[PDB]
């Protein structure tokens, strides 16, 4: 099977450069026109530039056009695009795809780019607990909230990703240069507690790792 | 070769 | 520069019946060529883009028949003959006879359910966000039906809009509901100058809002 794994996205500072690259296989790379597209965090797909089978010729949108580079290693089976003059509207998942039967094909997996000058900061962790005795005394739901951080992702799993059902973990919002999100669980007031729950979240960027027991509130 | 008109020919 | 116009915005479907979704074009994707370039694919939630559809009709042989795509000149339509549960996603049109490349905006098709009023939580600050001095409250809404809701916040029956930070996951693919979460976000110093803190959610399924609320 046609397989394309993009990689070198990460956070980049306004007018700065990041190069990607897309590790293409199971097909005869040095026959196909490559494309970069990107869908930005709002769902919009957009894109991005085109390079022919050869390397001869690149073509690009004006709003990318004198900042960015689209070239390829065919002995390498690599497609790759140098952008430069970051800006933070280039913000977004970028998509490495081929270009064939009048059009595009395939997409790979895509790489996640952000550009803003925002620092990176690693976030609290807030355990959520109740008050009373649950109105379905039956099902208890419980949470954490994870504030405060930059860039994305964060991870957040439930007693170490044995506690999987039952589980919300919504999708973070960017506030002030800082995302939020929340979790929430939901378990047999028999079991809470009795034994512990515990939420484990973890922010790469900033190296750190939190485990929050939630411990019934007074 | 399948292209888009815009592509080189 | 070519203007994809897709509508409706989101559509909500049924399992086992029809389904189509349109797309216009600002000007003629036909070429002086005969050919005309108009895409269609589709995005599951957390995939990657799938080809769907290309020269307006042919279909990608890993799609089914229950597909079709047609339409000519500035308009042009995407067909399921009937929906299953994996047709979830958003679908693009997608442009490639003008330069550059454009796309529409993106149709999301939603699965029909049973109704269901949310579970509604609220949850008062953490000690630890307190001595941080500020505080949150928290307000889970989960496992819903229909999409569209409402939640306010009211502090001593007041109503206050100017700290809240929402957020709505994906139509869960398991269970087709929705859920929602909702965080009012003051200085630990207001938030201990009142006493009531209400989260008032309204849902389609009632006339009366779900009301949860502690004091202190």
Not at chain 3, 4 to 24: E, F
Not at chain 3, 58 to 82: H, M
Not at chain 3, 147 to 168: A, F, H, M, P, T
Request: with cysteine; hydrophobic share 30%; aromatic share 10%.
């Amino acid at each position: 099977e046609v397989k394309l794994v993009e990689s070198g996205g990460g956070l980049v500072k306004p007018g700065g450069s990041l190069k990607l690259s897309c590790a293409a296989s199971g097909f005869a790379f040095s026959s196909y026109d490559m494309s970069w597209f990107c869908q930005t965090p709002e769902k919009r797909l957009e894109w991005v530039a085109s390079i022919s089978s050869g390397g001869s010729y690149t073509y690009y949108p004006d709003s990318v056009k004198g900042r960015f580079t689209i070239s390829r290693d065919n002995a390498r089976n690599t497609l790759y695009l140098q952008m430069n003059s970051l800006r933070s509207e280039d913000t977004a998942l970028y998509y490495c795809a081929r270009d064939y039967d009048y059009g595009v094909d395939y997409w790979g997996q895509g790489t996640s780019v952000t550009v803003s000058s925002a620092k990176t900061t690693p976030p609290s962790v807030y355990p959520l607990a109740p008050g009373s005795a649950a109105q379905t005394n039956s099902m208890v739901t419980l949470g954490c909230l994870v504030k405060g951080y930059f860039p994305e992702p964060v991870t957040v799993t439930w007693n170490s990703g044995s506690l999987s059902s039952g589980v919300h973990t919504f999708p973070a919002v960017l506030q002030s240069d800082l995302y939020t999100l929340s979790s929430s669980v939901t378990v047999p007031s028999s079991t809470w507690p009795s034994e512990t729950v515990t939420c484990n979240v973890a922010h790469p960027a900033s190296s750190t790792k939190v485990d929050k027991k939630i411990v019934p509130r007074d | 070769p399948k292209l888009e008109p815009w592509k080189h020919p | 520069d070519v203007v994809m116009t897709q509508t409706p915005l989101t559509l909500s479907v049924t399992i086992g019946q029809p389904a189509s979704i349109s797309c216009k074009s600002g000007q003629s994707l036909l070429y002086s060529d005969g050919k005309t370039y108009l895409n269609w694919l589709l995005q599951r939630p957390g995939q990657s883009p799938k080809r769907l559809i290309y020269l307006v009709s042919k279909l990608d042989s890993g799609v089914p028949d229950r597909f079709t795509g047609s339409g000519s000149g500035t308009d042009f339509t995407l067909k399921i003959s009937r929906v299953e549960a994996e047709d979830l996603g958003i679908y693009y049109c997608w442009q490639g006879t003008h330069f550059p490349r454009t796309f529409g905006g993106g149709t999301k098709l939603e699965i029909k359910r049973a109704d269901a009023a949310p579970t509604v939580s609220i949850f008062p600050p953490s000690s630890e966000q307190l001595t941080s001095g500020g505080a949150s409250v928290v307000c889970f809404l989960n496992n819903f039906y229909p999409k569209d809701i409402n939640v306010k916040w009211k502090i001593d029956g007041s109503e206050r809009q100017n700290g809240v930070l929402n957020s709505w996951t994906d139509q869960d693919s398991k269970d087709s509901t929705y859920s929602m979460s909702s965080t009012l976000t003051l200085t630990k110093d207001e938030y201990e100058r009142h006493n009531s803190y209400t989260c008032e959610a309204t849902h389609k399924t009632s006339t009366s809002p779900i009301v949860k609320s502690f004091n202190r």
